[PDB]
Amino acid sequence: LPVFKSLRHMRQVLGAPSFRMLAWHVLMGNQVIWKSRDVDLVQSAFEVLRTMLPVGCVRIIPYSSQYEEAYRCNFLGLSPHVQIPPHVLSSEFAVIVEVHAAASLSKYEFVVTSGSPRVGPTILNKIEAALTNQNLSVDVVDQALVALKEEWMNKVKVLFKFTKVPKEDTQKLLSILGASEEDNVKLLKFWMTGLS
């Protein structure tokens, strides 16, 4: 009963700024750390978050008793008293979500942190915007995410096929495809790991 049910639910619970920072890290392939007493809640978090990535981009250690580095996983679950190394705590390339009992999910308080820095990537804005509109049916949200994800994976394919070979050509192509901006370029690079 105390689990995340959707992206939208997760957004309601964590809050808008926190969700956006969390989602940006998921999308870019940065390490996502969840520290909780509750194994199932954490599993539900990952089940929800993974829907934002191509299935090939997911490497999960669901509930570890020690910190594991990024090469080990991009999704990491943790026991409550596990200690996170300083480089992680201050990293701009990881996000930590810590769950505690508070004084759906009312009994928990969530704190989301990351090393301090943005505008994109585009799929994030589009995803956040869909979650935002409370007038959206669940099926619409779900089907839109699938589509959005597919559109972005296609761009990855197009980009891979294209750079099988000037160099300024790539930016030009990307520009037509609406994917020239710095974050979009970073996302495509990461998403390419989800392809052979």
Swiss-Prot record:
Tissue/organ expression: Expressed in most tissues tested, including skin, lung, kidney, heart, testis and stomach.
Protein modification: Phosphorylation by ULK1 modulates the interaction with GABARAP and is required to regulate autophagy.
PTM annotation (Phosphoserine): residues: 64, 175, 180
UniProt domain dDENN FLCN/SMCR8-type: residue ranges: 134-196
Residue stretches making up the cDENN FLCN/SMCR8-type domain: 1-132
Lineage top rank: taxon: Eukaryota
Stated role: Multi-functional protein, involved in both the cellular response to amino acid availability and in the regulation of glycolysis. GTPase-activating protein that plays a key role in the cellular response to amino acid availability through regulation of the non-canonical mTORC1 signaling cascade controlling the MiT/TFE factors TFEB and TFE3. Activates mTORC1 by acting as a GTPase-activating protein: specifically stimulates GTP hydrolysis by RagC/RRAGC or RagD/RRAGD, promoting the conversion to the GDP-bound state of RagC/RRAGC or RagD/RRAGD, and thereby activating the kinase activity of mTORC1.
Family note: Belongs to the folliculin family.
Disease tied to this protein: Birt-Hogg-Dube syndrome 1: A form of Birt-Hogg-Dube syndrome, a rare genodermatosis usually manifesting in adulthood and characterized by multiple fibrofolliculomas, trichodiscomas, and acrochordons. Patients with this syndrome have an increased susceptibility to develop renal cell carcinoma, lung cysts, and spontaneous pneumothorax. Inheritance is autosomal dominant.
Subunit structure: Interacts (via C-terminus) with FNIP1 or FNIP2 (via C-terminus). Component of the lysosomal folliculin complex (LFC), composed of FLCN, FNIP1 (or FNIP2), RagA/RRAGA or RagB/RRAGB GDP-bound, RagC/RRAGC or RagD/RRAGD GTP-bound, and Ragulator. Interaction with FNIP1 or FNIP2 mediates indirect interaction with the PRKAA1, PRKAB1 and PRKAG1 subunits of 5'-AMP-activated protein kinase (AMPK). Interacts with HSP90AA1 in the presence of FNIP1. Interacts with HSP70, STUB1, CDC37, AHSA1, CCT2, STIP1, PTGES3 and PPP5C.
Designated name of the protein: Folliculin
Record organism: Homo sapiens
Phylogenetic placement of the source organism: Eukaryota, Metazoa, Chordata, Craniata, Vertebrata
Gene assigned in the entry: FLCN
Residues of the whole record sequence present: 343 to 558 of 579
